[PDB]
Amino acid sequence: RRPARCYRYCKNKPYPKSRFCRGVPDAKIRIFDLGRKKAKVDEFPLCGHMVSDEYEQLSSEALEAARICANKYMVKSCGKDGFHIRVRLHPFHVIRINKMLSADRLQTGMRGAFGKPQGTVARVHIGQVIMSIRTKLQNKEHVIEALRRAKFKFPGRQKIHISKKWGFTKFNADEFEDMVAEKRLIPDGCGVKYIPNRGPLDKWRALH
Amino acid sequence: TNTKGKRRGTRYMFSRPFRKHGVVPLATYMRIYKKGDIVDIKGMGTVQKGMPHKCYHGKTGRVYNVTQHAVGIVVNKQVKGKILAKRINVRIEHIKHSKSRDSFLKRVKENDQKKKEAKEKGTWVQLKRQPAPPREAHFVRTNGKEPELLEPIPYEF
Amino acid sequence: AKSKNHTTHNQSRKWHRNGIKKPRSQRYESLKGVDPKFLRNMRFAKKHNKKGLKKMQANNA
Amino acid sequence: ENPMRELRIRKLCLNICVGESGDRLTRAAKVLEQLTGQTPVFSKARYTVRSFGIRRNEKIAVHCTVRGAKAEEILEKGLKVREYELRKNNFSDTGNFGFGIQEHIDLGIKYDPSIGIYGLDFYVVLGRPGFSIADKKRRTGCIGAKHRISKEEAMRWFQQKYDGIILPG
Amino acid sequence: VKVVKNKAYFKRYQVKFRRRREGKTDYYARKRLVIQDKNKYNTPKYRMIVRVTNRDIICQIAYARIEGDMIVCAAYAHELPKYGVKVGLTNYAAAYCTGLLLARRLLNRFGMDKIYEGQVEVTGDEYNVESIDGQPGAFTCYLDAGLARTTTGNKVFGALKGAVDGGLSIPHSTKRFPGYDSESKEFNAEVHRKHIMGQNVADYMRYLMEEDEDAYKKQFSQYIKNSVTPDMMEEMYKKAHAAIRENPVYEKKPKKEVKKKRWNRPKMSLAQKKDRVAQKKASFLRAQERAAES
RNA sequence: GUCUACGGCCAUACCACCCUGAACGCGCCCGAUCUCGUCUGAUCUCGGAAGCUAAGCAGGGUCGGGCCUGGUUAGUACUUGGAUGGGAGACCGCCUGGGAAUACCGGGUGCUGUAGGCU
RNA sequence: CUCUCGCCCACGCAGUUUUAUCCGGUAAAGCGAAUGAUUAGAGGUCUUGGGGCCGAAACGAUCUCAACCUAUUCUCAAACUUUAAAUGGGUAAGAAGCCCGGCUCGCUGGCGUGGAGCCGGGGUGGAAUGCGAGUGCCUAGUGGGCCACUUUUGGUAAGC
RNA sequence: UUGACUGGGGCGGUACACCUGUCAAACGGUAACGCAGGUGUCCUAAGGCGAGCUCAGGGAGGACAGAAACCUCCCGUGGAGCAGAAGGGCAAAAGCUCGCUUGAUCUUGAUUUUCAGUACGAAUACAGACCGUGAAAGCGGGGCCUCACGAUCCUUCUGA
RNA sequence: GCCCGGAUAGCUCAGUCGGUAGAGCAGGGGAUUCCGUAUCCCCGUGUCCUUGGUUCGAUUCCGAGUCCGGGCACCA
Ligand SMILES: [Mg+2]
Ligand SMILES: [Mg+2]
Ligand SMILES: [Mg+2]
Ligand SMILES: [Mg+2]
Ligand SMILES: [Mg+2]
Ligand SMILES: [Mg+2]
Ligand SMILES: [Mg+2]
Ligand SMILES: [Mg+2]
Ligand SMILES: [Mg+2]
Structure with a gap:
């Protein structure tokens, strides 16, 4: 397996797994949520992202080693089932190998040059989040140190950002409790389902 | 190399916009094309029988011939170093009236009548049109209040 | 002994070196390719307008 | 109270x-x-x-397919070999029903070994005056929810005429 | 719990036409029957719209414009009691007598009355009007049944022959007139001049006196109501063909007679329904607060 | 104030459910002798006029679903031209001009042409 | 060679813009919009797959995994797309035009209808900026290219 | 005499004639032994015209019948089919079944596509015959559209 | 150090028709015989390599990974 220097800066167009590729092996990440998936919304208020600084390609294999390095640290200190790690970007980009000498000039040179599939990597934009854990608010200094250990397994530069939302929802943490309180948000497991005031009135009659 | 076939680059442009498929509206056939009418070419994909080529889709020509179901249109084609006044037979569903001269025909109409309005009234109305002049020296009014101080917001991620 | 396949580099500037031209649309375009039944009537309209017309034309004109 | 809105045999x-x-x-x-x-x-x-x-x-x-007055006269044959009883799940979501029999000579047919024995599947659809607009050529329409007939409304019909038993097991 | 019904089938849905969803036309046969071959450039292609209904038949001549079809002249069958045929306004004899009314009224409007009188006596044979030279030409006209199954003996083809005997140049064949033997190839024109004067419904009266007078009162009650007796019926139509050929002009009733305007509901405003909701929300919270504390 | 016949634009007209429908009409409906067509007069075709607005149909209603249209998103994302701009690079900032899209929020909910009838 | 300017308006033309009017499916965006991918839980329950018991047995009675369904949620698409730029493409910006009168026709046809054709007359100032154009003949050399912004394809990368 | 292309040549392969989608950078054009494919046919109907009918799939039911037989209802914007490779297109249809047929005929030009603005091929709009189908307007000179093929010279048969 | 098919009881091997895992050796237990030889019969023994996808159905089909053996082999 070639170094991650070789399959770095996003050069080719996205070349995804479909009926045109048909021969690309499996990603080393196959599971993506590893804390307690069963949690509700109010059990883990704060969340913490690690944010990309540059536009590059992360391998599926580097995302495997990253979440393991974060899963291991947080069961040491926050304890098991006291967190919810979620790796957010998925590998869909197929890299190729022009696998020469399959010490000789004998196979070809660059004659038939288009490669066989070699693995899957993930195209990342600037400011896009990679990993996201969510815990109690008592565990804030364990958020960063989990993701600080996870950032040494990625190429390039990442910044770790404690977010301003409530959990893995999209609503702000200062006014969530004030606004889930009356009607506007209902909790269904690990997320929050917004209800507007423009549907049919019978679901408002089912509420209250 | 690149397969010199008719209907080659048209995965999208001989196709309907979306949710207007099905059989064509009938006013397209109840259109009146005489000689010298400026028409433009937009070939559909429902009628197979007379679609022009992918070279004329979006060009605009001039009718020289009208027949039972189609119209001869003389268009200009950019071939390499020169252009060619080329004539094509196109069925009637693939074209329409270009509105491009109808905003000239209105002015000529309301231009000549306004020209003889200056003969009876005696003026110098200057019917030739002009581009946008620089803005006139006008006057703003900040009545009562005072202007709003805005300043650049700080950076938060 | 491989060569270069196809470019259009330098080709656009030698088109405009002599100035790509409009085709010189000139008054009275010809009737080439107009459908014959319309065309066969119209010259019957031409070979009878000089002959049997001009005594009952100028007195109206 | 509901005039000319009544369940009639459309076909069998x-x-x-x-x-x-x-x-x-x-x-x-x-x-x-x-x-x-x-x-x-x-x-x-x-x-x-x-x-x-x-x-x-x-x-x-x-x-x-049998329509009109001859449809009920073959249907009443079928409800005596089955003895006027159905089950609840012989009544479909659109209301119409069917029951099916074995040994067709249990119905009025004389036996013949050169012919043999066959099993029928009687299937009744229900109707009201007005169901033709779903099968008319020219201005075909849907039926209206108040005019379509239900499962529970065809079993309250099979109790009414033919004094049947629903046998809710 | 069962399957994945629609929920965004409406997001992509493409409705057909206002006139296909209502079911009247087809637009496949309209496109081939209405649009003018455009090296004639303005000359209108004229139709004969024939539509039978329950209790009426409607005959119209229309042509197409781009803002809608234009109708030249129309003839109905509720009008037709004014010429004598007072009852049975959907049978084959009323259909033919509407087509002659629709043909004579048009040529009165265009001034072609004394030319093009057609076939004055009704023989049922394939009459075909031609163009007398020096005068205006025959009115050319094209039939459409629209959406009806044009089997032989369809009464849309009765109104096809009242037109043709009136002087409308309509191309047609005699193959679909009643009186065309299917397995043979002959056209029995005598069956058609029987069929055109309604002796078949006179014989269906005659078949019902001598068999069962009770069914002859169940059906045919309004023939007996005024006076229609099946020997008189063949002359009653023939006395109506004389009447429509001498005055087709269609006077009109002066139609004013009332000034009142209220029958159905107006669409209530935004504010009138926005406060209906706050009215409903009020009644829900007063039954949950009060009637569950008590 | 609406309808029928024929239409133009083709969801602001559709879908689902619920109320209302004076008069004309349109319908359901009643029949199978002829015309015609089926395994079946259900459809198609043909004779009617005893019933009925129950359906269709027409109006209206739904903190309606869609569709239509405008705010927000957003001068954001991209982008024309420019620099001996930054930076190991990846790419980023600026000058000069243009300039989107969703979630989310608001408003709408068929218009009319020719001919004819009711009020 | 044909002409245009020598001294209240250029015949004309254009690697340009403005004014209008058409064209397009890339960048972005989208997937709680179709197609193709894909992560998580919550609710619901016909059920089958498999357990837990009241039990000779009974879809008599009670839980769980899964499958399905519904509303949400993460992530994508050169050979997907509702939506959709910027740059770009075609046309138009008058006298070959506009209006009026008449007449030919074997084409068209209810029709002094339709449409072309020809003859006669009536009114020239018709976006900005710049420039003199139009045409015809004879014709050599050439038919190995190479580099740079930016856009891109193969390649780990290359003074490829 | 012993082909050419070719990341030297050979071996291999066909990028040697042709079609679809992408590359291709929103007109058109545009390369590599670039990517995913297809062609050297099949069809008297799978051609032509009319009429009738709706497809995939799913739900609830119906003797043997069960995931899969047949019948029935309801839902069904194309999720099926249209000979095939793909794209476009298509619902009283261009799909399915049936009824009649041979326009898959004779003949002169024009035009488009590739383009040098040549040919072959393929296609378009006509016009002059003779016919089909249909009540009719119409539609039809092969296949729903984009590929399905071939000069001089020679031979062969046909035509006055 | 690249490709062609194979991964199955203690072994080995066929078939894993999209619907059971069965020949045969080795051990076990009988029967047979005066007693044995052979023989005969029955029993025992399959994560059908690992996981993912495709239908009341996959070890079987599909295609990933691991493993085992078998191989394309120029003038210089
Ligand atoms: Mg009969
Ligand atoms: Mg019969
Ligand atoms: Mg009946
Ligand atoms: Mg009603
Ligand atoms: Mg009602
Ligand atoms: Mg409404
Ligand atoms: Mg709404
Ligand atoms: Mg720039
Ligand atoms: Mg510079």
């Missing part, structure tokens, strides 16, 4: 599905013609499955 349709054609499917059309008095029409397959002995376009079954 019958079939026998034989696994093959030839001799056996032919004299089964003789049976179904004796119940009705009009000639059968031959249905056929469209999936050769190679596990039923079937083949595509091979004439697999016979069926006919």
Whole structure:
């Protein structure tokens, strides 16, 4: 397996797994949520992202080693089932190998040059989040140190950002409790389902 | 190399916009094309029988011939170093009236009548049109209040 | 002994070196390719307008 | 209180599905013609499955449809061999029903070993005055939810006429 | 719990036409029957719209414009009691007598009355009007049944022959007139001049006196109501063909007679329904607060 | 104030459910002798006029679903031209001009042409 | 060679813009919009797959995994797309035009209808900026290219 | 005499004639032994015209019948089919079944596509015959559209 | 150090028709015989390599990974 220097800066167009590729092996990440998936919304208020600084390609294999390095640290200190790690970007980009000498000039040179599939990597934009854990608010200094250990397994530069939302929802943490309180948000497991005031009135009659 | 076939680059442009498929509206056939009418070419994909080529889709020509179901249109084609006044037979569903001269025909109409309005009234109305002049020296009014101080917001991620 | 396949580099500037031209649309375009039944009537309209017309034309004109 | 909005028999349709054609499917059309008095029409397959002995376009079954006054006179034959009882799940979501029998000589047919024994499938659809607009050519329309007939409204009909039993097991 | 019904089938849905969803036309046969071959450039292609209904038949001549079809002249069958045929306004004889009314009224409007009188006596044979030279030409006109199954003896083809005997140049064949033997190839024109004067419904009266007078009162009650007796019926139509050929002009009733305007509901405003909701929300919270504390 | 016949634009007209429908009409409906067509007068075709607005149909209603249209998103994302701009690079900032899209929020909910009838 | 300017308006033309009017499916965006991918839980329950018991047995009675369904949620698409730029493409910006009168026709046809054709007359100032154009003949050399912004394809990368 | 292309040549392969989608950078054009494919046919109907009918799939039911037989209802914007490779297109249809047929005929030009603005091929709009189908307007000179093929010279048969 | 098919009881091997895992050796237990030889019969023994996808159905089909053996082999 070639170094991650070789399959770095996003050069080719996205070349995804479909009926045109048909021969690309499996990603080393196959599971993506590893804390307690069963949690509700109010059990883990704060969340913490690690944010990309540059536009590059992360391998599926580097995302495997990253979440393991974060899963291991947080069961040491926050304890098991006291967190919810979620790796957010998925590998869909197929890299190729022009696998020469399959010490000789004998196979070809660059004659038939288009490669066989070699693995899957993930195209990342600037400011896009990679990993996201969510815990109690008592565990804030364990958020960063989990993701600080996870950032040494990625190429390039990442910044770790404690977010301003409530959990893995999209609503702000200062006014969530004030606004889930009356009607506007209902909790269904690990997320929050917004209800507007423009549907049919019978679901408002089912509420209250 | 690149397969010199008719209907080659048209995965999208001989196709309907979306949710207007099905059989064509009938006013397209109840259109009146005489000689010298400026028409433009937009070939559909429902009628197979007379679609022009992918070279004329979006060009605009001039009718020289009208027949039972189609119209001869003389268009200009950019071939390499020169252009060619080329004539094509196109069925009637693939074209329409270009509105491009109808905003000239209105002015000529309301231009000549306004020209003889200056003969009876005696003026110098200057019917030739002009581009946008620089803005006139006008006057703003900040009545009562005072202007709003805005300043650049700080950076938060 | 491989060569270069196809470019259009330098080709656009030698088109405009002599100035790509409009085709010189000139008054009275010809009737080439107009459908014959319309065309066969119209010259019957031409070979009878000089002959049997001009005594009952100028007195109206 | 509800005038000219009443359940009437729209048609009664019958079939026998034989696994093959030839001799056996032919004299089964003789049976179904004796119940009705009009000639059968031959249905056929469209999936050769190679596990039923079937083949595509091979004439697999016979069926006919009976309307009007003769539909009820074959239906009342069918409700006495089954003894005026159905189950609750013979009443479909659109309201219309069916029950099916075995040994067709339990219905009025005399026996013949050269003919044999076949099983019918009586299937009744229900109707009101106004159901023709879903099958009319010119201005075809849907039926309106207040005019369509329900499962529970056809079983309250089969209790009313024919004094049936629902047998809710 | 069962399957994945629609929920965004409406997001992509493409409705057909206002006139296909209502079911009147087809637009496949309209496109081939209405649009002018455009090296004639303005000359209108004229139709004969024939539509039978329950209790009426409607005959119209229309042509197409781009803002809608234009109708030249129309003839109905509720009008037709004014010429004598007072009852049975959907049978084959009323259909033919509407087509002659629709043909004579048009040529009165265009001034072609004394030319093009057609076939004055009704023989049922294939009459075909031609163009007398020096005068205006025959009115050319094209039939459409629209959406009706044009089997032989369809009464849309009765109104096809009242037109043709009136002087409308309509191309047609005699193959679909009642009186065309299917397995033979002959056209029995005598069956058609029987069929055109309604002796078949006179014989269906005659078949019902001598068999069962009770069914002859169940059906045919309004023939007996005024006076229609099946020997008189063949002359009553023939006395109506004389009447429509001498005055087709269609006077009109002066139609004013009332000034009142209220029958159905107006669409309530935004504010009138926005406060209906706050009215409903009020009644829900007063039954949950009060009637569950008590 | 609406309808029928024929239409133009083709969801602001559709879908689902619920109320209302004076008069004309349009319908359901009643029949199978002829015309015609079916395994079946159900459809199609043909004779009617005993019923009925129950359906269709027409109006209206739903904190309606869609569709239509405008705010927000957003001068954001991209982008024309420019620099001996930054930076190991990846790419980023600026000058000069243009300039989107969703979630989310608001408003709408068929218009009319020719001919004819009711009020 | 044909002409245009020598001294209240250029015949004309254009690697340009403005004014209008058409064209397009890339960048972005989208997937709680179709197609193709894909992560998580919550609710619901016909059920089957498999357990837990009241039990000779009974879809008599009670839980769980899964499958399905519904509303949400993460992530994508050169050979997907509702939506959709910027740059770009075609046309138009008058006298070959506009209006009026008449007449030919074997084409068209209810029709002094339709449409072309020809003859006669009536009114010239018709976006900005710049420039003199139009045409015809004879014709050599050439038919190995190479580099740079930016856009891109193969390649780990290359003074490829 | 012993082909050419070719990341030297050979071996291999066909990028040697042709079609679809992408590359291709929103007109058109545009390369590599670039990517995913297809062609050297099949069809008297799978051609032509009319009429009738709706498809995939799913739900609830119906003797043997069960995941898969047949019948029936309801839902069904194309999720099926249209000979095939793909794209476009298509619902009283261009799909399915049936009824009649041979326009898959004779003949002169024009035009488009590739383009040098040559040919072959393929296609378009006509016009002059003779016919089909249909009540009719119409539609039809092969296949729903984009590929399905071939000069001089020679031979062969046909035509006045 | 690249490709062609194979991964199955203690072994080995066929078939894993999209619907059971069965020949045969080795051990076990009988029967047979005066007693044994052979023989005969029955029993025992399959994560059918690992996981993912495709239908009341996959070890079987599909295609990933691991493993085992078998191989394309120029003038210089
Ligand atoms: Mg009969
Ligand atoms: Mg009959
Ligand atoms: Mg009846
Ligand atoms: Mg009603
Ligand atoms: Mg009602
Ligand atoms: Mg409404
Ligand atoms: Mg709404
Ligand atoms: Mg720039
Ligand atoms: Mg510079």
